[PDB]
Amino acid sequence: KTALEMVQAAGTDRHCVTFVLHEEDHTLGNSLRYMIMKNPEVEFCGYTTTHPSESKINLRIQTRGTLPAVEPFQRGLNELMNVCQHVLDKFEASIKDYKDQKA
Amino acid sequence: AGILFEDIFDVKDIDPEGKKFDRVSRLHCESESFKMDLILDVNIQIYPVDLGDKFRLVIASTLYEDGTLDDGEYNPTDDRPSRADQFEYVMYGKVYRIEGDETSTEAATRLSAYVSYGGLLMRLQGDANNLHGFEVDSRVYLLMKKLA
Amino acid sequence: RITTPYMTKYERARVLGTRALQIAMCAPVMVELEGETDPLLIAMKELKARKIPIIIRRYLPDGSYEDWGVDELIIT
Amino acid sequence: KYGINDNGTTEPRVLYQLDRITPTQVEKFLETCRDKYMRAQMEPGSAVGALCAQSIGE
C-alpha cells in the first residue's frame, strides 16, 4: 500500500494527481522530481513532507494537457533506474581500471 | 495587430538614487518621436543596459501578430512564430493604475500609466492620445530590442 | 421585532450546544448526515441547512419577551 | 481640467478612467457599508464589563 494516488477533484481529472509515497524521504522525492521535471509535458511537479514525524512524501504532478500523470510519473521512475544502472557500471569499470594501474 | 504603443527610447539615467539592488536597475528614459518619459525596471543580469543605449519598446496585448487573444496559459515549451522572435527582452505584467498629471491646474493632457511586471514597475507618461488603449486591470507584454 | 435580526454569537453557541446534546442523546437528525460520528459536527451541519427545531426567546430587561425562530434570524 | 463631457462622447476614451465610478459599484458600496455597520454592533448578551476590566488591566 506504498503508493496511494489522490485525484485533485471529485471529477477525478487525470491531469492533476497527488501520489502519496509511504516510507519515503527527500532522497527519492528530490531525485524523482528532477527526472520528472525534465519532461516537457509536466507543468508543475513538487514534493511536500506532511510532517517530519510521518515518513510519507506527497508528490503532485500537474500535466500540460490530457496526459493522465501516471505516465509522466512512471517515465520518471524508469529514467532514474537507467541513470543508476549507467553510473554503477561506469563507477565499477573506473574502480577496476584504477586498481590495475596501481598493480 | 495587437500593439498598444511603440516608440524608440534613449536611456538618460541608470540609477538616480544609487544601486539599491544587484539584478535590477531603474532606467529613466526619454523618447524621440513623442514626448514620453519612461521609468523602467529591467533585470540587468540577463540583459545589460548602459547609460547611452537606444532601444525600441513595443507594448502589445497579444504575443501573436494574427490578433488572437487566446491566452488560457502561456507554454514556454511550445514553438510557433510570434512577436518575441524579433525582440531580445520580453516581460508580462498588468496595467494597474491610470492617473492624471497633478502639475497643472488647468488645460492638461498628460497621463501616467503604471504597469507592474511582478513587482518590476513601469511608469509611462505622455499625451493622452498616445496612451490610448490602456485600461486598468489589463495584461500587456513589454517587448524591447537594443539598436546599434 | 425591535430586537436585532442578526443571531448573536452567544445565541449560536447555545443553539449548537443544546442541539448537539439532543443529537448525542438519540434525537432525530434532519440533515441526512454523511459519515459524521461527532454530535457537534452534526449540529453545525443542521444550522447551515437552517433545519434546527429550537426557538430563541429573547427577554427584554423590563420582563417583556420576543421569540425568534433559529431559521428566521440571519446567521453571519 | 481635462475637458471631459458628461455625455460620454469625448474621443480619447482613456479619460474616463481617471475618476471612474459606475452604478453597480455605488450599489455594492452602499450595501457593504450598511452590512458592516449592522454586524459591528455590540451584540446583546456581551459581558461588556469583563472586556472593559481586562482592556485597562493588561
UniProtKB/Swiss-Prot annotation, chain A:
GO terms for molecular function: DNA binding; DNA-directed RNA polymerase activity; protein dimerization activity. This is DNA-directed RNA polymerases I and III subunit RPAC2. Component of the RNA polymerase I and RNA polymerase III complexes consisting of at least 13 and 17 subunits, respectively. Pol I complex consists of a ten-subunit catalytic core composed of POLR1A/RPA1, POLR1B/RPA2, POLR1C/RPAC1, POLR1D/RPAC2, POLR1H/RPA12, POLR2E/RPABC1, POLR2F/RPABC2, POLR2H/RPABC3, POLR2K/RPABC4 and POLR2L/RPABC5; a mobile stalk subunit POLR1F/RPA43 protruding from the core and additional subunits homologous to general transcription factors POLR1E/RPA49 and POLR1G/RPA34. It is linked to Treacher Collins syndrome 2: A form of Treacher Collins syndrome, a disorder of craniofacial development. Treacher Collins syndrome is characterized by a combination of bilateral downward slanting of the palpebral fissures, colobomas of the lower eyelids with a paucity of eyelashes medial to the defect, hypoplasia of the facial bones, cleft palate, malformation of the external ears, atresia of the external auditory canals, and bilateral conductive hearing loss. Its main location: nucleus. It is found in: Nucleus; Nucleus, Nucleolus. One of its GO terms (cellular component) is RNA polymerase I complex. Keywords: Acetylation, Disease variant, DNA-directed RNA polymerase, Nucleus, Transcription. Signal peptide: none annotated. It comes from the Eukaryota.
Swiss-Prot record, chain B:
SMART domains: RPOL8c. It holds the Pfam family RNA_pol_Rpb8. Keywords: Acetylation, DNA-binding, DNA-directed RNA polymerase, Nucleus, Transcription. It comes from the Eukaryota. It is found in: Nucleus; Nucleus, Nucleolus. GO terms for cellular component: cytosol; nucleoplasm; nucleus; protein-DNA complex; RNA polymerase I complex; RNA polymerase II, core complex; RNA polymerase III complex. InterPro entries: NA-bd_OB-fold, RPABC3. Residues 15-39 are annotated as: Non-specific ssDNA binding. One of its GO terms (molecular function) is single-stranded DNA binding. GO terms for biological process: transcription by RNA polymerase II. The modification N-acetylalanine is found at residue 1. Gene3D superfamilies: Nucleic acid-binding proteins (2.40.50.140). Belongs to the eukaryotic RPB8 RNA polymerase subunit family. DNA-dependent RNA polymerase catalyzes the transcription of DNA into RNA using the four ribonucleoside triphosphates as substrates. Common component of RNA polymerases I, II and III which synthesize ribosomal RNA precursors, mRNA precursors and many functional non-coding RNAs, and small RNAs, such as 5S rRNA and tRNAs, respectively. PANTHER family: DNA-DIRECTED RNA POLYMERASES I, II, AND III SUBUNIT RPABC3 (PTHR10917:SF0). This is DNA-directed RNA polymerases I, II, and III subunit RPABC3. The lineage of its organism: Eukaryota, Metazoa, Chordata, Craniata, Vertebrata. The gene is POLR2H.
Curated annotation (Swiss-Prot), chain C:
GO terms for molecular function: DNA binding; DNA-directed RNA polymerase activity. The keyword Plastid does not apply. Belongs to the archaeal Rpo6/eukaryotic RPB6 RNA polymerase subunit family. GO terms for biological process: transcription by RNA polymerase I; transcription by RNA polymerase II; tRNA transcription by RNA polymerase III. Keywords: Acetylation, DNA-directed RNA polymerase, Nucleus, Phosphoprotein, Transcription. This is DNA-directed RNA polymerases I, II, and III subunit RPABC2. It is found in: Nucleus; Nucleus, Nucleolus. The keyword Disulfide bond does not apply. Signal peptide: none annotated. Its main location: nucleus. DNA-dependent RNA polymerase catalyzes the transcription of DNA into RNA using the four ribonucleoside triphosphates as substrates. Common component of RNA polymerases I, II, and III which synthesize ribosomal RNA precursors, mRNA precursors and many functional non-coding RNAs, and small RNAs, such as 5S rRNA and tRNAs, respectively. Pol II is the central component of the basal RNA polymerase II transcription machinery. Pols are composed of mobile elements that move relative to each other. One of its GO terms (cellular component) is RNA polymerase I complex.
UniProtKB/Swiss-Prot annotation, chain D:
Transmembrane segments: none annotated. It is found in: Nucleus; Cytoplasm, Cytosol. Expressed in the brain, in the cortex and the white matter (at protein level). It comes from the Eukaryota. Disulfide bonds: none annotated. Component of the RNA polymerase III (Pol III) (Pol III) complex consisting of 17 subunits: a ten-subunit catalytic core composed of POLR3A/RPC1, POLR3B/RPC2, POLR1C/RPAC1, POLR1D/RPAC2, POLR3K/RPC10, POLR2E/RPABC1, POLR2F/RPABC2, POLR2H/RPABC3, POLR2K/RPABC4 and POLR2L/RPABC5; a mobile stalk composed of two subunits POLR3H/RPC8 and CRCP/RPC9, protruding from the core and functioning primarily in transcription initiation; and additional subunits homologous to general transcription factors of the RNA polymerase II machinery, POLR3C/RPC3-POLR3F/RPC6-POLR3G/RPC7 heterotrimer required for transcription initiation and POLR3D/RPC4-POLR3E/RPC5 heterodimer involved in both transcription initiation and termination. Belongs to the RNA polymerase beta' chain family. This is DNA-directed RNA polymerase III subunit RPC1. The gene is POLR3A. The chain holds residues 986 to 1043 of 1390 of the full protein.
